[PDB]
Design a protein around this nucleic acid. Structure first.
Ligand SMILES: [Mg+2]
Ligand SMILES: [Zn+2]
Ligand SMILES: [Zn+2]
Ligand SMILES: [Zn+2]
Lengths: 168, 97, 171, 84, 229, 51, 58, 507
RNA sequence: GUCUUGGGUG
């Protein structure tokens, strides 16, 4: 049913342990390869979306499909309705409320700013846009992979992030 | 009984270019069957329970990449005899190289 | 976590539907079919980016049946948990044997044995909830909780977490 | 990737006997499954003869994808291939 | 590139005969009064004589015919045989054109020489066995239709068209269009199982059949033998 | 019986009683056990000494 | 010919059969890449969208 | 549509990748280990688990289902078991290649005798084809008699026993090479070494040519039969597997007690011979595994080869439904592309015709007429595949035909049918005709078509095939029809001419 | 309901 560009994965005689998920250790599964592909087979960098990029994309898609339904003619509790099916509406309502309960970047402008500033592994890249962290300690212990890369810059990046973080 | 649509009849159908008629003679007018193959190992060792909607190739520990194929019952029997003599006819539904 | 996902859906169309407004009918069928489903290999399909602008391409007639096949490829958004990933939530249910917290499109339940022991349950409080010196896991609380288990059931999956580890639990 | 632009299509502009036979069979099967009919049906009720009428009037909504030996292909609508 | 049901034995008329007979059949002369077109067949008979900007085209036609003569006699058919299976029966086309356009009463023909020559030249560049702007495609296309072009030029010669067949312009255009269409119909279709067809066409005659011949010799040939009987 | 292979077959046959002349002919029949494995046309040939 | 020996050799050398032939598609009961099956028949949308709007999927 | 719904996608075979079955994978795909010889439970119902008729192997019975998959005999494919062998044995179909690999490799440390240092082999490696590469490596590596530094043996074959002569340094001590020793030597070949000889790391490992665990086929591959209403004999493969099991257990009765070295070899060789003749009973220079009736056992190889074997007898050609045969007759009053079909055959054969808003009156008249009157119908197929037999249905008047339903009406005038006379030497021996339904029991042919069929009317019989769909009807009428075959490509001339009396009469 | 043998037909 639900399939993707991941195709054969044919059987070599030696089997492997790498199917074990552990997000502390950059093991995600053979569906989120470090270099993705598209539906035209062209190579493309992996996507790992923070809550901000995701919130913008979902709001945009729902209002776009509503504009499509209306012939060309505002709130998540309403904006999730665009789907088809009661389970669909419920799931998307929970997702949108989850996004609007934790979206520190509540606009496309600051999302663009963080996009420029950030562009490094997309996992921690998005988790920084998702996880407010005071100093180096919270980041390097909750995300243990920033240690063995010797390009941290967490101090100032997090400072400017929490500075750009809107009130609540 | 039925009449034999032998090899020379197949030659005449091939000369005529009637591929659909040949497939219909050899399948729907004869031993047509449906088997499940493992999408990973390509052996007909898949355990299908159709009323419980559950499938499994135990050897590969697989339950999701399984396909159905319509093939002659004589072809299934041929592959099982080949397996009986330690050959693995692996039926793959997509080309790699 | 939300993942952008390139995904496909093979479909079959009867000749009776072979009309002038075909592509939009297939678009509506796709949108109905995929918007909400779970798959153990991908996560949860909440929405689809640019839903009305999916390309159905050109369908192929199956020899012998007369129905058209389409490989409608498109890029969507999927949400999948992973054991050892931290996910925030808000509590939904309460019970002596633990509480439920809604995570993404799911609901996560934490067991009694996996909770800091300063937390005490109360069947008699107004409102009923877990309580401690200077803390209250009332209904509508926030919970930064880690996932330490996810079973894959084809339609709906369930994850049982543990707030027993540092920097986790009530916030 | 494997599709050929409509300008450098170097196969025959004529419907072959096999393409005509398969197109007529497929159209007949479709019409026998209560598919819509593009021609004006005047007298005949047999789906094969209706399909022949549609083929002559260039009103069969199908496409032939002609595979080359190297895997590439050319696409030709039935209405633009020439029928003898 | 032709389907094996579509070809019929036809004589190539530039091949046989002596050089004098060839010259009398094919050579026209404009300045020379007697060896020109018979005046009583065309409207413009008096206007023809003495021209030069047309005798050039007549000489080009005759030189192409001599090229075909030399080619067929020295490369293709060295032993003189001129009756070979070829697509599109031109005898039948010409007689059908005569029947359709009623070529009796030997009426003055309104069909000018330059139009005849250019019509046959254009026709020879419209018989497509291979389509494409590539250069090897062009070479293979011309190699494909060289013999058939020899036939079409041996039949549709200026003297023959004007004197022997007495066609007018309408019958001429009909002959060209019919050659176009019937040649496009004589081509093999992609998808033919020509290997199975060839195997059957060779094997079936074997069922009805001191040099070794027949079945034992065919068996030696197909089962390639290091020594033969 | 246990050596049915390597034994001559068809030495005994069901008497043909379809018509009278068929019976009379079956009772006077003869068999050369050359076998059909082999395309030697020589023993199949009508010979002068057959007169 | 030599069916069993050839199959044994195919096993012992891991031959990959492309299935582009005639006999191979015959024994698997599929449409051979031959004659009427040497091409594909798609569903045309460009010609289809000319139909009356009342002949539409509902 | 006559297959119950499965949720898997339907696909077609694009690639076949042959291989050997690895002993790991043989154990993995199995569903039950097979070790107990005896067939029945104890002359009773519900047979011995772990025998050759384990219900885990699948169902071959109409009122029983497969305990492995939960399906009845109409739909259960069958499931494989496995049967571990006491000693490893040669695969009968791989002894020559085992011998070749033994000659090529170092039989102590598992390494190629020569390296890329020698440029002849260094260029023999450069062949892409595994078989050509293997030949180019064997034609060189087979003669070097040393590696470690141990000398190489001269491998030889005597029956199923691979002898290897070690010429030390005089007397060359010749020892028997058992399958287990060769298996141990073969497991040590490194992946790149293995690649060089032409094998594969994932699909064909040279030690898999030695059998250590044997697959047991489901009962579908070896079904029983009924003699007189109460009797059954097992298939040859079943008795052969039972003999193999007896041999295995006898082997396990020697390494557990006294065995003066002339019984271990004998019983292990019995296992080897049973396993060999289970697969190939046409081995040169030895007796054949026999039946107590004196016939030889029908081995799998004998099942697969020949005019009557699987490939040529069941896959390249097979018996088909919806066909008819009878004597042919001549009819001056038929058209060239017409064939006269007897009424009885026209009623026995049928065509499934989908009900549409252009054929509902005609089809409902056929449904009312019934299967004993022409033109009638035999079956009504509902929109899900359920058949309504109109013989036993007493109430043929109470059927209303739905759209999309299917009526299997009789054979009728102008139906295209394929008509055929054997032998079919050329494409015009099989031609498509329009039907005309007639009295009396012979087919009717216009007399000009007897030449392409090579037929006459003094006993000849011809076959008639009815296309069961609209696509095959269209194919017949637009490619195989008699008018389209008048000119042949064999000699670019006609094949049908005016014949016999019309020729004499027109003269 | 199966395997061999034999007699035949085009
Ligand atoms: Mg006869
Ligand atoms: Zn598998
Ligand atoms: Zn089963
Ligand atoms: Zn060594």
């Amino acid at each position: 049913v639900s399939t993707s560009t991941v195709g054969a994965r044919r059987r070599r005689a030696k089997q492997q342990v790498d199917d074990e998920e552990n997000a502390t250790l950059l093991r995600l599964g053979p569906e989120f390869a470090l270099k993705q592909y598209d539906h035209d087979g062209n190579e493309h960098d992996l996507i790992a979306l923070s809550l901000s990029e995701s919130r913008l994309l979902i709001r945009e898609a729902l209002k776009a499909r509503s504009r499509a339904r209306n012939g060309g003619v505002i709130d998540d509790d309403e904006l999730a309705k665009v789907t088809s099916g009661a389970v669909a509406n419920g799931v998307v309502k929970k997702t949108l409320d989850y996004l609007n309960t934790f979206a520190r970047f509540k606009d496309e402008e600051t999302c663009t700013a963080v996009d420029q500033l950030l562009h490094l592994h997309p996992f921690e890249i998005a988790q920084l846009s998702s996880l407010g962290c005071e100093d180096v300690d919270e980041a390097i212990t909750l995300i243990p992979s920033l240690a063995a890369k010797k390009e941290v810059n967490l101090q100032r990046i997090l400072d400017e992030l929490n500075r750009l973080e809107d009130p609540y | 009984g039925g009449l034999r649509f032998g090899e020379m009849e197949r030659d005449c159908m091939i000369a005529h270019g009637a591929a659909g008629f040949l497939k219909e003679r050899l399948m729907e007018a004869s031993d047509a069957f449906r088997v499940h193959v493992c999408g990973i190992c390509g052996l007909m060792s898949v355990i299908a329970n159709l009323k419980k909607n559950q499938f499994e190739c135990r050897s590969c520990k697989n339950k999701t990449n399984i396909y159905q194929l319509h093939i002659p019952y004589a072809a299934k029997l041929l592959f099982q005899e080949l397996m009986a003599m330690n050959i693995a006819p692996r039926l793959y539904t997509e080309r790699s190289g | 976590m939300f993942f952008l996902k390139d995904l496909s859906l093979i479909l079959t169309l009867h000749p009776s539907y072979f009309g002038p407004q075909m592509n939009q009918y297939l678009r509506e069928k796709l949108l109905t079919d995929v918007e909400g489903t779970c798959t153990g290999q991908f996560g949860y399909i909440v929405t689809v980016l640019d839903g009305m602008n999916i390309d159905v391409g050109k369908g192929r007639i199956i020899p012998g049946s007369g129905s058209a096949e389409f490989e409608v490829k498109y890029r969507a958004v999927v949400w999948k948990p992973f054991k050892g990933e931290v996910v925030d939530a808000i509590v939904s249910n309460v019970s002596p044997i633990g509480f439920f917290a809604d995570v993404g499109p799911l609901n996560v339940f934490v067991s009694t044995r996996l909770i800091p022991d300063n937390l005490v349950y109360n069947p008699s409080n107004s409102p009923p909830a877990y309580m401690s010196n200077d803390e209250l896991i009332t209904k509508g609380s926030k919970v930064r909780l880690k996932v330490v288990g996810t079973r894959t059931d084809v339609n709906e999956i369930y994850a049982i977490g543990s707030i027993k580890e540092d920097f986790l639990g009530a916030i | 990737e494997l599709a050929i632009l409509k300008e450098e299509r170097t196969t025959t502009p004529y419907l072959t006997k096999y393409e005509r036979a398969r197109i007529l069979g497929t159209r007949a099967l479709q019409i026998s499954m209560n598919a819509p009919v593009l021609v004006d049906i005047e007298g005949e009720t047999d789906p094969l003869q209706i399909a022949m009428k549609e083929l002559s009037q260039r009103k069969i909504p199908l496409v032939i994808r002609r595979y080359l030996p190297d895997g590439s292909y050319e696409d030709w609508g039935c209405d633009e291939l020439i029928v003898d | 590139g032709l389907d094996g049901t579509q070809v019929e034995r036809q004589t190539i008329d530039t091949i046989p005969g002596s050089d004098k007979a060839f010259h009398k059949r094919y050579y026209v002369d404009l300045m020379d009064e007697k060896n020109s077109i018979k005046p009583d067949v065309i409207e413009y008979a008096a206007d023809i004589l003495g021209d030069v900007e047309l005798q050039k085209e007549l000489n080009s036609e005759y030189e192409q015919l001599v090229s075909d003569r030399k080619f067929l006699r020295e490369i293709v058919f060295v032993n003189g045989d001129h009756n070979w299976p070829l697509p599109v029966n031109l005898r039948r086309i010409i007689q059908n054109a005569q029947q359709i356009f009623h070529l009796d009463r030997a009426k003055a023909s309104d069909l000018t020489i330059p139009e005849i020559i250019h019509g046959v030249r254009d026709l020879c560049k419209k018989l497509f066995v291979l389509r494409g702007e590539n250069e090897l495609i062009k070479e293979a296309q011309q190699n494909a239709t060289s013999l058939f072009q020899c036939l079409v030029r041996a039949r549709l010669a200026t003297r023959r068209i004007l004197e022997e067949f007495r066609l007018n312009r309408d019958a001429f255009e009909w002959v060209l269009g019919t050659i176009e269409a019937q040649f496009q119909r004589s081509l093999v279709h992609p998808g033919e199982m020509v290997g199975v067809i060839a195997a059957q066409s060779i094997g079936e005659p074997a069922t009805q059949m001191n040099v070794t011949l027949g079945v034992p010799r065919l068996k030696e040939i197909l089962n390639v033998a290091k020594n033969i009987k | 019986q246990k050596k049915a292979m390597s034994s001559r077959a068809g030495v005994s046959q069901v008497l043909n009683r379809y018509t009278y002349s068929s019976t009379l002919s079956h009772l006077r029949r003869t068999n050369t056990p050359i076998g059909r494995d082999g395309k030697l046309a020589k023993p199949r040939q009508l010979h002068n000494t057959h007169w | 010919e030599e069916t069993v020996e050839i199959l044994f050799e195919a096993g012992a050398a891991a031959e990959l059969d492309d299935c582009r032939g005639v006999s191979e598609n015959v024994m698997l009961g599929q449409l051979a890449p031959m004659g009427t099956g040497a091409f594909d028949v798609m569903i045309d949308e460009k010609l289809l969208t000319s139909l009356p709007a009342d002949y539409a999927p509902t | 549509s006559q297959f119950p719904y499965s949720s898997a996608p339907l696909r077609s075979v694009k690639e076949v990748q042959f291989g050997l079955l690895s002993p790991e994978e043989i154990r993995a795909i199995s569903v039950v280990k097979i070790e107990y010889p005896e067939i029945m439970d104890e002359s009773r119902q519900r047979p011995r688990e772990g025998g050759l008729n384990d219900p885990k192997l699948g169902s071959i019975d109409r009122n029983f289902k497969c305990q492995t998959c939960g399906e009845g005999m109409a739909e259960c494919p069958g499931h494989f078991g496995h049967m571990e062998l006491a000693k490893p044995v040669f695969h009968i179909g791989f002894i020559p290649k085992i011998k070749k690999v033994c000659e090529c490799i170092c039989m102590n440390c598992g390494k190629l005798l020569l390296d890329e240092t020698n440029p002849t082999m260094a260029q023999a490696i450069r062949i892409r084809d595994p078989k050509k590469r293997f030949n180019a490596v064997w034609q060189l590596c087979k003669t070097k008699m040393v590696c470690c530094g141990n000398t190489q043996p001269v491998v030889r074959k005597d029956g199923m026993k691979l002898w290897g002569t070690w010429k030390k340094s005089a007397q060359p001590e010749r020892k028997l090479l058992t399958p287990g020793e060769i298996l141990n030597v073969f497991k040590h070949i490194s992946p790149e070494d293995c690649f060089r000889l032409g094998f594969n790391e994932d699909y064909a490992r040279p030690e898999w040519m030695i059998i250590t665990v044997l697959p047991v086929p489901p009962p579908q591959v070896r079904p029983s039969i009924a003699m007189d209403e109460t009797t059954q004999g097992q298939d040859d493969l079943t008795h052969k597997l039972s003999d193999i099991l007896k041999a295995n257990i006898n082997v396990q009765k020697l390494e557990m007690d006294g065995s003066p070295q002339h019984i271990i070899n004998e019983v292990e060789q019995l296992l080897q011979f049973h396993v060999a003749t289970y697969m190939d009973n046409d081995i040169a220079g030895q007796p054949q595994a026999l039946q107590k009736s004196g016939r030889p056992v029908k081995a799998i190889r004998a099942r697969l080869k020949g005019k009557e074997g699987r490939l040529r007898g069941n896959l390249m050609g097979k018996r088909v439904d919806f066909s008819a045969r009878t004597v042919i007759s001549g009819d001056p009053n038929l058209e060239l592309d017409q064939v006269g079909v007897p009424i009885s055959i026209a009623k026995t054969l049928s065509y499934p015709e989908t009900v549409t808003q252009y054929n509902i009156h005609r089809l409902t008249e056929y449904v009312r007429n019934g299967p004993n009157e022409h033109p009638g119908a035999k079956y009504v197929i509902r929109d899900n595949g359920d058949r309504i037999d109109l013989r036993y249905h007493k109430r043929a008047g109470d059927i209303v035909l739905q759209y999309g339903w299917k009526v299997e009406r009789h054979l009728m005038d102008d139906d295209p049918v394929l008509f055929n006379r054997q032998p079919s030497l050329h494409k015009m021996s099989m031609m498509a005709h329009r039907v005309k339904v007639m009295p009396y029991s012979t087919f009717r042919l216009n007399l000009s078509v007897t030449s392409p069929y090579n037929a006459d009317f003094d006993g000849d019989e011809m076959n008639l095939h009815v296309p069961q769909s609209e696509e095959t009807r269209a194919e017949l009428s637009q490619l195989c029809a008699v008018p389209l075959q008048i000119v042949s490509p064999q000699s670019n001339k006609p094949v049908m001419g005016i014949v016999q009396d019309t020729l004499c009469g027109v003269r």
